[PDB]
Amino acid sequence: MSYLLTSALLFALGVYGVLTRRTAILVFLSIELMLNAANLSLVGFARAYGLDGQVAALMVIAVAAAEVAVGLGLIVAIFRHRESTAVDDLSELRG
């Protein structure tokens, strides 16, 4: 059960990262950390509920890879000509 509590704590740490980070890429890293915490919870509950969570986490890996590829393309396109990757540098769209 310590595994599930640790997965929740890693999700919390990724939340702290996404909120605290200034850089886009480090936020994306904290999100990946959240995903891996989710995968650990899934593996525990598959050990409990019969092995489906393993294939679940596999598909999650593939989904993660897709979103990592596309998001890194985005990060390239937005900060190729532009200056520091700092996410606060774009405040054009205001309420």
4: closest CA among 51, 44, 46, 36?
44
> Residue 23, SS3?
strand
Give the burial class of 53: count Cβ atoms within 10 A of its Cβ; 0-12 exposed, 13-18 middle, 19 or more buried: buried
- Binding to another protein in span 10-39, by CB under 8 A: 10-39
> In the bound complex, what is the minimum distance in angstroms from residue 56's beta carbon to another protein?
5
> In the bound complex, what is the minimum distance in angstroms from residue 81's beta carbon to another protein?
10
> In the bound complex, what is the minimum distance in angstroms from residue 64's beta carbon to another protein?
7
- Binding to another protein in span 76-95, by CB under 8 A: 76-80, 83-95
